[PDB]
Structure 1
Amino acid sequence: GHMIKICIAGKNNIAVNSLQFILKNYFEADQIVVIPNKNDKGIDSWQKSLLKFALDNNIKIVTLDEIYNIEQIIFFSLEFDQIIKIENFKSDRLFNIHFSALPKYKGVFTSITPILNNELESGVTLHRIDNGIDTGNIIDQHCFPIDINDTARDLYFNYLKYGESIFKKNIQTIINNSYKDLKQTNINSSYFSRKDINLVHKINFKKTSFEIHNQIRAFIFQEYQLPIINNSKIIKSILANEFIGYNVFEEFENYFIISGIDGFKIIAQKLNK
């Protein structure tokens, strides 16, 4: 049918590197169109620009309106900023990679919400897009650890890495329309919206050491913000299993020593600045 076979919509190194993989291995420029996010400035920053890569490689920049009527197009969202409505499209070949182990942690801020809710693991999930937010049927998932001292930033860079890999693992079956999927369960399903998360976190210290530590590290993502204790930004939290007494809080020039209601030692390292 159409010249155009695939649309990559989204941002950051997962979208750029997945687009590069399709251009190298599957489709020529003239067979691909791209929809960057509204905030893409067309320059590289701490992630690469999808808009810049597409323009550099002669791939057309399009709008959703411009692709709705393309028969059989593969629409692939990789951190795309718009919620689509499936009945706009002639094609039913609509796919997304979501940065959580669905059915948990639908919605936004998924580098914060699993840590803040005390998880030991997260995942990336390739799924069909339906009209709900991260609700469509699951094609593949890869779960991986949230290590004990990982921050939100560390978790995000794992999503980028594992998300790119799950794209490469599954894309041929998507192209060939040969994949299998399974509906999501009602149980374990959870969802967080922007209004659920205050990005300026105020720590509750009447909590376990593990909870105070998770509260701190869930907000460490320096490109956006760092959590603040007594007007100092915190760059790293370290949780040990050493008991130091209950409810410790002491400030030093370079760090705080903290424990919660169970008394395990936390070192909260101040940003050097």
Structure 2
Amino acid sequence: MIKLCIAGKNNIAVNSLEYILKNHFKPDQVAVIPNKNDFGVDSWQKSLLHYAFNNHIKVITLEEAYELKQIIFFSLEFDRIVKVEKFKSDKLFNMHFSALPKYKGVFTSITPILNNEVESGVTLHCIDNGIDTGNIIDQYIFPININDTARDLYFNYLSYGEYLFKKNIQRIINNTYENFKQNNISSSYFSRQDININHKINFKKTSFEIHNQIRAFIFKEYQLPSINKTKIIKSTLTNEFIGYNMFEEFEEYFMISGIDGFKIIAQKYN
């Protein structure tokens, strides 16, 4: 019988399924639910369907998952809403890519950078009927490096999320894991409508903030930000003082400072 379902995508889904098959369940005891854009081709991330092809793991639909009493269900970067009322099983887990209770919702590779954080996290939680509201099982807090793009923070979510999955899976299978209610204080949330790539950069800000407004949108597979109609592939914040409110376009880059005068190098796409 199916004991465990992985729903989602990318190295976190693939490497977590590999760990299950090495350590916990036989191929016939596991199923995958792919994202809508998985076409079995490994690229900047591994394809869950390609892993399932090589390893003869079966696919189920979300509607089939609903009916399997006792299944352990994990969303790992899943692209569909998990409706807890629809499931017979109450063993439903999500790896949310933030330090809950902060940054519930979407685009968590963008929102902590845009909001001037120097740390993020991954949180393994129970799925309940709210958006990323369920009880925490475990959390890993880690730094946002000063020149990380959204893409760099995303790759860190994938690594630490895989780490939390492997750390907690035995206690989840044994049903010996502890879970705690999320705090109401410091709880934050961003919807799709709260993120706008086309939003003009506000230059009447610190160098840190101008740099954040650029690098939060650097994720080349999805998009790059623009300055004066040129795409930017990298932003570098220095602590060199070059004077307040500087802006100079060079052949390959922009030199920028905000209200505190620290030099930003914004590298042009070429």
Say whether the fold is shared (TM-score over 0.5). yes
The answer as to 2:217 corresponding to 1:219 is yes
Matches within 5 A, 1:4-153: 4-153=2-151
The letter for the 1-side match of 2:12 is I
The answer as to 2:264 corresponding to 1:270 is no
The letter for the 2-side match of 1:89 is F
In structure 1, stretches of 5+ residues that fail to align are none
Distance 2:48 2:140 in 1: 24
Distance 2:73 2:251 in 1: 52
Q: Which runs of 4+ in 1 moved over 4 A?
A: none
Q: Secondary structure in 2 aligned to 1:165?
A: helix
Match of 2:196 in 1: 198
Distance 2:113 2:179 in 1: 28
The letter for the 1-side match of 2:74 is F
Distance 2:113 2:107 in 1: 11
Distance 2:231 2:188 in 1: 30
Match of 2:164 in 1: 166
Which segment drifts farther, 68-77 or 114-123? 68-77
Distance 2:264 2:152 in 1: 19
In structure 2, stretches of 5+ residues that fail to align are none
Could you tell me whether the CA contact under 8 Å between 1:246 and 1:262 is conserved in 2?
A: yes
RMSD: 0.9
- TM-score, normalising length: structure 1: 0.97
CA shift, 1:208, in A, is 0.8
Q: Deviations over 1:141-197 (max 9, x none)?
A: 000000111111110000011110010000000111110010011111111111111
CA shift, 1:201, in A, is 4.2
Q: Secondary structure in 1 aligned to 2:66?
A: coil
Distance 1:270 1:259 in 2: 17
- TM-score, normalising length: structure 2: 0.98
Distance 1:21 1:265 in 2: 45
